[PDB]
Symmetry: D2
Subunit: 124 residues, 4 copies
């Protein structure tokens, strides 16, 4: 059968899809490569160009984090939901990290499923 | 008895509370007074200074909108949830409006309940 | 102007609406009148009959609680979101209470807004 | 590096974990093996025994569905969030399916991460 984690469009097989000739679902993560510990910084997450209507939109974005050295992983950092037609799939968070790891962005399209983005962030 | 809508701390009786000597829960809405129709703009919502830990944080922010002339109201625009300790209660949305109305921000504190902010926005 | 809490259709002015000739939005709360402290019980929340499609559904239900004697109120107990067309607006929670108070149910319709239901529960 | 989908504890490597000597995180899905199309049925999802407190609980459960023959997958069916200490990680949904596939349950623990359960459902 198939596992849930396999269902997710990784950014590697995100380019060789027929729907990525019309609309990008893979989230774009804007965030500094290095930050200071306990210091606040911005992370922007956005998807586009994609339609935005009742019948077809990015419904929500999930932001997770793999913390290096944490016993279990990942930690979910935030979740934002967008109203189709009113809100663009574009959001800025403010974060404080203690340790290095990887930011993950998950976008959900009501027609096109779950799309993943990854970004390394070091904490010095 | 008491109705749900009465339970919410309005920004009028938000100043005469004993807990607003230690921490502000009333959301701050940053958004243009006037925008063009169908044109995208930023709305920032933030709460602070408030603690941010497992035992005590702003768990989530809801962004709603009263659309003038819409038969029923309001329209929920977005919802963001923050992980205690990692995410600051500070978020930026991107919106497209068609008609004038009022932005509402609702913050939730796990100890201190529901707090409301209001901001008029005109669409010309 | 108008406050957010006033926008919510109470179950009193829920009967004298023109849309309640076609569809009920006011949640139905099924829960025992009295429970024992720290003891688990079921609470069912449902809305209907209402359409359930992409263009028109109950998007989500929020369950809150006014705890008698708690310094601030209310406590949000749960939140469930339903996929239009697949999930019925019908959910059962399991709760443990320590003190008496009032359960509140909030349903959201993407066309028809926010609807409220109230149910007293005693903890002996 | 590692992909997001790999981070998720499958129910296969869920038994050979040191924390499954103290608490089960893998969701239990109760649902009929076969249902009729467009006909409503119950799906119960629960996690336990697990602690339920501010510092440590199942925060939320996501219910997804792989629809056989659907161009893209999966469809998210529902999402429920539980207040630590008040709500048990136990929820019942009502669903209508049109086509056969697989139900997925994802539980989130604030310490122990993401846990997966799978259940085949036929629509005749
Ligand atoms: Fe799409
Ligand atoms: Fe507070
Ligand atoms: Fe309706
Ligand atoms: Fe755990």
């Amino acid at each position: 059968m198939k596992s849930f984690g396999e269902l997710i469009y990784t950014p590697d097989r995100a380019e060789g899809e027929a729907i990525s000739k019309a609309e990008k679902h893979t989230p774009k993560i804007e965030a500094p490569e290095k930050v200071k510990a306990d210091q606040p910084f911005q992370v922007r997450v956005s998807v586009g160009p994609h339609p935005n209507e009742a019948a077809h939109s990015i419904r929500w974005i999930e932001l997770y984090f793999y913390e290096e050295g944490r016993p279990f992983n990942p930690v979910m950092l935030g979740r934002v939901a967008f109203e189709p037609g009113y809100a663009e799939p574009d959001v800025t968070f403010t974060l404080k990290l203690k340790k290095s790891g990887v930011l993950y962005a998950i976008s959900y399209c009501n027609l096109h499923g779950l799309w993943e983005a990854r970004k390394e962030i070091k904490v010095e």
